[PDB]
């Protein structure tokens, strides 16, 4: 139904080594499709998805142009930031920035994204109304003042309702095979005896897309949070995701526990139980 297209910029100043490192990635939902690395042997926009590979030279040249433009912008923003926080040029610093657009079922702009942080902490973000800004500290209020002064929110907004949505749509139409896909996770329960009185039950959900998924454990129908371990959703390295949830159970009560998996690729939620 709803889709999303986001961009991630990461700039890292490296004293005594020259220009800052600029790494940017483009995502359609949970699928990376483009990359720009300043430390690449030939810095340029590159395809990380088969469906974007069909784009002509113009796309890559323009994309590279905008990427490098952003690179320079962030490059000045680093120094300006140095002035703001009264910092030294001998120290390493980082500017991060994520911005995207959300296509709804009606084909209209559902939600907008444009947030930037400095050194791991919020710096300035675009509000839901896509018109006003929110600054985290006093230094960011200067940036907010400037952006208000030059009507930046308007430009980025025209971008959100324009090229962003259209190209997102185009991508979705090009790579429907994998982008409009909803693969259900291959799930199963495993047994791992801790001692002669304890054993760990692990619930596996593999090769599912998109990444969003819910794993829970229940003892006699009641959710278990005690002695439970849920690992962070991880990439399979092939365009899929993985995630397992383990419970520490006293021997003899294994058949009293059930796994519960909610995923988009599943018609109904799954209820699993150890099958020796």
């Amino acid at each position: 139904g709803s889709h999303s297209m986001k961009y991630f910029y990461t700039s890292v100043s490296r004293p005594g080594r020259g220009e800052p490192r600029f790494i940017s990635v483009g995502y359609v939902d949970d699928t990376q499709f483009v990359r720009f690395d300043s430390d690449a042997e030939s810095p340029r926009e590159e395809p990380r998805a088969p469906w974007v590979e069909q784009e002509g030279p113009e796309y890559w040249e323009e994309a590279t142009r905008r990427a490098k433009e952003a690179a320079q912008t962030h490059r000045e923003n680093l120094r300006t930031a140095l002035r703001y926080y009264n910092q030294s040029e001998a120290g390493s610093h980082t500017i991060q920035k994520m911005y995207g657009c959300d296509l709804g079922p009606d084909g209209r702009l559902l939600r907008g994204y444009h947030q930037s942080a400095y050194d791991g902490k919020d710096y300035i973000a675009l509000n839901g109304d896509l018109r006003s800004w929110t600054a985290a500290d006093m230094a960011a209020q200067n940036t907010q003042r400037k952006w208000e002064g030059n009507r930046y929110a308007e430009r980025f907004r025209a971008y959100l309702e324009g090229e962003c949505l259209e190209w997102l749509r185009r991508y979705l139409e090009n790579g429907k095979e994998t982008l409009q896909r909803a693969d259900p996770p291959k799930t199963h329960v495993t047994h791992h005896p801790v001692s002669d009185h304890e054993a760990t039950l692990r619930c596996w959900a593999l090769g599912f897309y998109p990444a969003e998924i819910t794993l829970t454990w229940q003892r006699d129908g009641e959710e278990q949070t005690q002695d439970t371990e849920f690992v962070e959703t991880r990439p399979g390295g092939d365009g899929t995701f993985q995630k397992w949830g383990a419970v520490v159970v006293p021997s003899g009560e294994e058949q009293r526990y059930t796994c519960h998996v909610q995923h988009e690729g599943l018609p109904e939620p799954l209820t699993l139980r150890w099958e020796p």
């Binding site: 994309a63 905008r66 433009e69 912008t73 000045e76 300006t80 710096y123 952006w147 430009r155 980025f156």
Partner: peptide, 11 residues
Amino acid sequence: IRYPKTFGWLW
């Protein structure tokens, strides 16, 4: 696609 810089977003 990427955001086209026309004026810029200097901090």
